[PDB]
RNA sequence: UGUCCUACGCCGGCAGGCGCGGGUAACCCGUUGAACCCCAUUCGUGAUGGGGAUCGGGGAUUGCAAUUAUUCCCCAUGAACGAGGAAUUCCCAGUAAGUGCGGGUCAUAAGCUUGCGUUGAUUAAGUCCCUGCCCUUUGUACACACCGCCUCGCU
């Protein structure tokens, strides 16, 4: 968490390209889960940070709860006067909500973070499995979760997909602009549910004997046989 | 040189997924039509929606 | 903190799962923040609310004036929906504490974010 | 390194002008009076006498030409900046790092690369855990392959 002190939070709010792109994958993520129109649903925001994706969710009428570990992200989110509620915690220890709670889940650039072992007590696979199991717990049955990432290799992808398919989630991932570089995004979307004579001439060639040249009329019926 | 690097790292990701699949079956239970031949990029198609690629999870 | 948020909150401790709910409350600063009133959200999500937990939570927050039964309808009763909107979505616990019933660990609501760290 | 390096004298608070000499070089710049460092004063935990950008005015120099500031000097303003979360860069002794000084590019920049000297540290004499490279064995492992299991509903 110690990146996002007051200085880096002040950087994060003062970045036009970053705000624009977070709004773009926030819109794409909200489009990617098929929540019904004119039904205000209840969502879980992961990697809310300053609440840019949370601000987009509040703009569309949906209600959301943000979860983060950096204090300056939540402080600047309060300073931005967001409408949703904030919670200060890590996904790797488990999301502390009842079963059948969230109608949808949106994670924005928050899932590639748990793929490496940084402390001696830490373990990436078990933390990711706990995170996915807690997602499967707190989500309502029949909901959908969209999880945005920028994988630096396929090791992170295989660990994330194994821990996702081991916690009971079903789905896949969709890549936006796979052939592009600037627009390539990863969205893990999960939810709680004549030939014969040719061969013979080749055979005679491997047996090393003289063969006729192979031409157009190789296998051709001469005439009807009565 | 960089084109071959892109091709080999994409092949490495694909083979790593295809080797992820068998232990996923054991212990448990991509944009080809969007290629642009003339140059690197992404061109819209009329019959299909905006470019994407879905690889479902097992 | 919105009333509904703690009303759906649990404890992330491994041992107490999944029976760490409901959380016991404490408030020293209560504010009112306006929220747009969409009656579809309330009408759909009252059946999602555990009413015994809601009553004991209101009793923890010194507050008694709530309907005692599940208010189900077609968004025709403006008074009940408006009052529950004020309680759940507009009454905000700016400062306070949350104690876990099955473990005893306390999370400080400090303007206005509770902590969920080890 | 030097026919542009400059000693010395005068003027201007400074960038800079004037005059007179040495040097085709271990001879003159040059006993290369450098910067870090030491001593003494003030400041005092304060986006502050820290930090310098971005600005306004004036002067001078280099050039045919300085406007979108070539460059320097002086005054007026003190923005961000509170040790920086998840890719990693270099390194085992006069070494890293701090610190200044030369050559090449150059009618004038200061910014790139090469070296040079001064003060001078922590850890280690280990390993294949990762990465990259070079070997030996093997086609036993996975995969391909074997075999099994391999759509319904009227006349």
From Swiss-Prot, chain A:
Its EC number is 2.1.1.-. GO terms for biological process: chromatin organization; positive regulation of rRNA processing; rRNA (guanine-N7)-methylation. The keyword Kinase does not apply. InterPro entries: Bud23-like, Bud23_C, Methyltransf_11, SAM-dependent_MTases_sf. Induction: Up-regulated in CD8+ T lymphocytes by treatment with anti-CD3 and in B lymphocytes by treatment with CD40 ligand and anti-B cell receptor antibody. In macrophages, no induction following LPS treatment. Down-regulated by a combined treatment with TNF and IFNG (at protein level). Transmembrane segments: none annotated. One of its GO terms (cellular component) is nucleus. It catalyses: a guanosine in 18S rRNA + S-adenosyl-L-methionine = an N(7)-methylguanosine in 18S rRNA + S-adenosyl-L-homocysteine. Widely expressed, with high levels in heart, skeletal muscle and kidney. Detected at high levels in bronchial brushings and in normal lung (at protein level). In fetal lung tissue, expressed in the developing bronchial lumen lining cells (at protein level). Tends to be down-regulated in lungs affected by inflammatory diseases or neoplasia (at protein level). Expressed in immune cells, including B and T lymphocytes and macrophages. One of its GO terms (molecular function) is protein heterodimerization activity. It is an enzyme of class 2 (transferase). May be ubiquitinated and targeted to degradation in response to pro-inflammatory cytokine signaling. It is found in: Nucleus; Nucleus, Nucleoplasm; Cytoplasm, Perinuclear region; Cytoplasm. Pfam families: Methyltransf_11, WBS_methylT. Disulfide bonds: none annotated. Keywords: Chromatin regulator, Cytoplasm, Methyltransferase, Nucleus, Phosphoprotein, Ribosome biogenesis, rRNA processing, S-adenosyl-L-methionine, Transcription, Transcription regulation, Transferase, Ubl conjugation, Williams-Beuren syndrome. Residues 200-226 are annotated as: Disordered. Heterodimer with TRMT112; this heterodimerization is necessary for the metabolic stability and activity of the catalytic subunit BUD23. Interacts with GRIP1.
UniProtKB/Swiss-Prot annotation, chain B:
Residues 1-10 have a biased composition (Basic residues). It comes from the Eukaryota. Residues 34-44 have a biased composition (Basic and acidic residues). Weakly expressed. Expressed at intermediate level in testis and ovary. Coiled coil: none annotated. It is found in: Nucleus, Nucleolus; Nucleus membrane. Belongs to the RRP12 family. This is RRP12-like protein. The chain holds residues 1188 to 1257 of 1297 of the full protein.
From Swiss-Prot, chain C:
Disulfide bonds: none annotated. Changing residue 8 to W: Abolishes interaction with METTL5 and THUMPD3. Reduces interaction with ALKBH8, THUMPD2 and TRMT11. No effect on interaction with N6AMT1 and BUD23. No effect on expression of exogenous TRMT112. The keyword Cytoplasm applies. One of its GO terms (biological process) is rRNA methylation. Changing residue 5 to A: Abolishes interaction with N6AMT1, METTL5, TRMT11, THUMPD3 and THUMPD2. Reduces interaction with BUD23 and ALKBH8. Reduces expression of exogenous TRMT112. This is Multifunctional methyltransferase subunit TRM112-like protein. Residues 2-118 form the TRM112 domain. Pfam families: Trm112p (PF03966). GO terms for cellular component: cytoplasm; cytosol; nucleoplasm; nucleus; perinuclear region of cytoplasm; protein-containing complex; tRNA (m2G10) methyltransferase complex. Belongs to the TRM112 family. It is found in: Nucleus, Nucleoplasm; Cytoplasm, Perinuclear region. GO terms for molecular function: protein heterodimerization activity; protein methyltransferase activity; tRNA methyltransferase activator activity. It comes from the Eukaryota. Acts as an activator of both rRNA/tRNA and protein methyltransferases. Together with methyltransferase BUD23, methylates the N(7) position of a guanine in 18S rRNA. The heterodimer with N6AMT1/HEMK2 catalyzes N5-methylation of ETF1 on 'Gln-185', using S-adenosyl L-methionine as methyl donor. The heterodimer with N6AMT1/HEMK2 also monomethylates 'Lys-12' of histone H4 (H4K12me1). The heterodimer with ALKBH8 catalyzes the methylation of 5-carboxymethyl uridine to 5-methylcarboxymethyl uridine at the wobble position of the anticodon loop in target tRNA species. Changing residue 5 to R: Loss of interaction with METTL5, THUMPD3, THUMPD2 and TRMT11. It comes from Homo sapiens (Human). Keywords: Cytoplasm, Nucleus, Phosphoprotein, rRNA processing.
